[PDB]
Amino acid sequence: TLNGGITDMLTELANFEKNVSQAIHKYNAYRKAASVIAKYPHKIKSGAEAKKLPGVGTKIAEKIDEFLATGKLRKLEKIRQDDTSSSINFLTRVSGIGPSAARKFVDEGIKTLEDLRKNEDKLNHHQRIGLKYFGDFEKRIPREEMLQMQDIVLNEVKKVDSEYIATVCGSFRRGAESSGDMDVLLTHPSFTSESTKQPKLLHQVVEQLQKVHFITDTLSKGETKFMGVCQLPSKNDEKEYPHRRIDIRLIPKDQYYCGVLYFTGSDIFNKNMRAHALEKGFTINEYTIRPLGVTGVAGEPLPVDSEKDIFDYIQWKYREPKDRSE
DNA sequence: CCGACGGCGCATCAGC
DNA sequence: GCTGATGCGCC
DNA sequence: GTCGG
Ligand SMILES: [Ca+2]
Ligand SMILES: [Ca+2]
Numbered sequence A: 001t002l003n004g005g006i007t008d009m010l011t012e013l014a015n016f017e018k019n020v021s022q023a024i025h026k027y028n029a030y031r032k033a034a035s036v037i038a039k040y041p042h043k044i045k046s047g048a049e050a051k052k053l054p055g056v057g058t059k060i061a062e063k064i065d066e067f068l069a070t071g072k073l074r075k076l077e078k079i080r081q082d083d084t085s086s087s088i089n090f091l092t093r094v095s096g097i098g099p100s101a102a103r104k105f106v107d108e109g110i111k112t113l114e115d116l117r118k119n120e121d122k123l124n125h126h127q128r129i130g131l132k133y134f135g136d137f138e139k140r141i142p143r144e145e146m147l148q149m150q151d152i153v154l155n156e157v158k159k160v161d162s163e164y165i166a167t168v169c170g171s172f173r174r175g176a177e178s179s180g181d182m183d184v185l186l187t188h189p190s191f192t193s194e195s196t197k198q199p200k201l202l203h204q205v206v207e208q209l210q211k212v213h214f215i216t217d218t219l220s221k222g223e224t225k226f227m228g229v230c231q232l233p234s235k236n237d238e239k240e241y242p243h244r245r246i247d248i249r250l251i252p253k254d255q256y257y258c259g260v261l262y263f264t265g266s267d268i269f270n271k272n273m274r275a276h277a278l279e280k281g282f283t284i285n286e287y288t289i290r291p292l293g294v295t296g297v298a299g300e301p302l303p304v305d306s307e308k309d310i311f312d313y314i315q316w317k318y319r320e321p322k323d324r325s326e
Numbered sequence B: 001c002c003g004a005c006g007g008c009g010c011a012t013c014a015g016c
Numbered sequence C: 001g002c003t004g005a006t007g008c009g010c011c
Numbered sequence D: 001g002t003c004g005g
Helices: A004-021 A024-039 A047-051 A058-070 A074-081 A083-091 A099-108 A113-117 A125-132 A134-138 A143-160 A201-211 A253-264 A267-279 A307-313
Strands: A165-168 A182-187 A215-221 A225-230 A244-250 A282-284 A289-291
Touching: A004 A024, A004 A058, A004 A074, A004 A083, A004 A099, A024 A267, A047 A058, A074 A083, A083 A099, A125 A134, A125 A215, A134 A244, A143 A165, A143 A182, A143 A201, A165 A253, A182 A201, A182 A253, A201 A215, A201 A225, A201 A244, A253 A267, A253 A307, A267 A282
Parallel strands: A182 A244
Antiparallel strands: A165 A182, A215 A225, A225 A244, A282 A289
């Protein structure tokens, strides 16, 4: 990380714009800039040098010049000083509390972890579980634990129905030595774009994982997406593992490659790739890649038999998951 | 200058 | 109840 | 906040 100071600065600004200003485009701009700088293979010596990069404009150039000169940014110094900004930024670190709810809480005088813990009845379900495991969800997951988690999940769905396929995606699939959480893609042949030949396909898997005490809580749950909490079992006389966030996404079996491309990410890589696709006259979601018509209306799904086929359509050389960490 | 910025699942609420 | 908007979440 | 046109 040659430019960790700069990318941290920009990430902090992104978070401020999102959580406090509620300026989502500024949020995205700062994150794009942080990402392009993060992969830039030189120690940056000036804001002019940075402005050469796409997504870094005049305003970020000037900030970079300030940061390089002084080691800090006065704008961020003041934001860190501000009680209301500081409080809102903190509250959004709880899962389920976004920028709107955080500001509303701060209005009511709920602005610390302690305040939240005495006001649980003022939270919805997601928020209550996010608060319950606030400390644990701050922790990262070593790959060794991710491998244990993978082995449990893959073997338990195998027990429900051997025709399930579970694939761990996200940062794990990109080969990260540690992950923020666990993302699991699920398919079953009875769920395609053409038909659903069995009910409760996701529910049965969630229930089995609950049965063996792996899944411990649920943040939200529908027919194709589960958002919840899980925990590795621990051995005799040793401290319990931290509770971990887990997402499970059931995708039509014939749309696996669009699905695994989406769920492998990174999020910025996906934004970049989908933005690029548009410029080639295609639109990509987790299901399909479709041509855009003369009017900009999405056409019918294109044939896809591999991840590379999706890259092929938009004229990108294939990129392995490990090179998608943007 | 200015439109566009990736795409969507689940929970919640107002209006009906 | 539903539908559409909004909030928050995922990559 | 940034970029393409
Ligand atoms: Ca993840
Ligand atoms: Ca996740």
